[PDB]
Structure formats: C-alpha cells, structure tokens
Amino acid sequence: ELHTLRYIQTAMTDPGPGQPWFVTVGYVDGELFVHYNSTARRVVPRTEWMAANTDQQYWNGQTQIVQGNEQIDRDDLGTLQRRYNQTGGSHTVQLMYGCDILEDGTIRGYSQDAYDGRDFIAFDKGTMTFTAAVPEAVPTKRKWEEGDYAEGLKQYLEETCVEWLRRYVEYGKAELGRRERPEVRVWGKEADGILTLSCRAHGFYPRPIVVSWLKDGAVRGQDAQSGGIVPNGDGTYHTWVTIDAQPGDGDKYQCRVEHASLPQPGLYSWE
C-alpha cells in the first residue's frame, strides 16, 4: 500500500494584505492534516482523526519545532537578499521535504529548497551532500557540510518521518481508505455548428480517476479537453472533460467514469 508524508514551508516578504508571512502545512496520502501560520502562532489540526487521536502534549511540542523554523526563515529572508544584492521587493523562500512508502517496500526520502521559485539546495541521501543549483547556494552548501547536519536530516527522512506517517495512517484508517462515489452530470452546448459535450464528476474520494469520452462504443482521446483533478473544501475531489462534436451526434456519445468507489465503470450520457 502506497503511503506518503509531505511537509511544505513558505516564507514571504509580500504576503501581502491581511495574510500571514509564514505558512506551513503537512500531508498524509495527499490529505491536509496539520496547519501553522505566523498570525495565529499555533499548530491546529485539519482532520477529525488527527485531533481525536493526539493529546495536548503533542500539539504544544509541534508548535515550538515550527516556531524555531519561523525564526530561521525570518533571518534567511534577510541573509539571502544580501547575497543576491537586493534592497527589497517581493521575495519567497520555499521548502519541500518528506518520505514515501512505495508499493515495492522501498522508502524514498527527499529534501528540496527554493528562492523566488528557482532551485537553491537539494539534499542527496546517497552521497550525504547538499547539491547547489545556483552560485549563491555555495556558502549554504559549505556551512551545512562541515557541521554534519546531513546526518540528522538522513535520520529524520529514514526513521522519524516513517514512524510518524505509519501512526497517522493508523489514526485515519477509515478516513484515508474510504470510497466515495462521484455524482456525474452530462450537459451539451451548441454554438457555431459545434456541439460541446461536458462530463462533470462531483465529490469523489480517493483522488485517482479516469474520465473518457466514447463515440459508438470506441474511445475518443485527442479531441477531449480536461481540467485535471481539482479539490473541494470538504476533502473530496472534482473533474471535468469536454469534447467537440458535430451537431446531431450527441446520442452516439457516452461518458465513461473509472473510479475505485464504483465496482464497474459507470456509463453516462446527455439523455
């Protein structure tokens, strides 16, 4: 079974109006479970399974781990501006790290950093060295290698990350492993001698879905336009696939929805 843990960090100089400068969130199998912002200054759960399983000791302890990271990113925003020779303006520091438990049992650990949307420092678990993408990343590479900070980071991605992710999966066993059926609606619009058939799926879980258009029982790929898998505010997902067809052929077209919740692929039409 595939299980992933991802922690993303964002430090901004221009949030801007009525928004926190430091935002950081966590993900268990692509689902939002933990949140922290520079305004509230407290780690708040985002799922019911997270709050019901953890005590006050954990929530108070996690806040200080992030509070320290907030201070580090505050100093780094000023330190990096001096290296690039910048007086002010809009600048963003992004950090992405976590561990993935693959289907074949292999554990993959990653830690990447960026400045203004461009790669800065990428951790290599094999060679135990921090890779520099830009010439301004060399002083960070030199500093992090002498102090042997790579050993503590390797200990986290291989041990601390895996142990906690395995616990979070156990806490939300019924929530993460649930099957939610999508509500499918088919609507056609005729304009300039073109019939546009839209197939929309509402509120499904998990995230993977295969929505394909069929004409006379045969699948039509290249003509179909999709908007990908977009999320909902309650943890569910949404998707839309549109196809351009000749007017008077609408009845020949059928939308096929392939999802884990449905035992057999559901066939829908404009009716």
């Binding site: 992030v66 320290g68 960070t140 601390t160």
Partner: peptide, 9 residues
C-alpha cells in the same frame, strides 16, 4: 512530525 531545522542558510 515537522523536522526541526538545525541551522540557518
């Protein structure tokens, strides 16, 4: 659990 950064850039 979040990783505690042991050093500044």
């Amino acid at each position: 659990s979040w990783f505690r950064k042991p050093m500044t850039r």
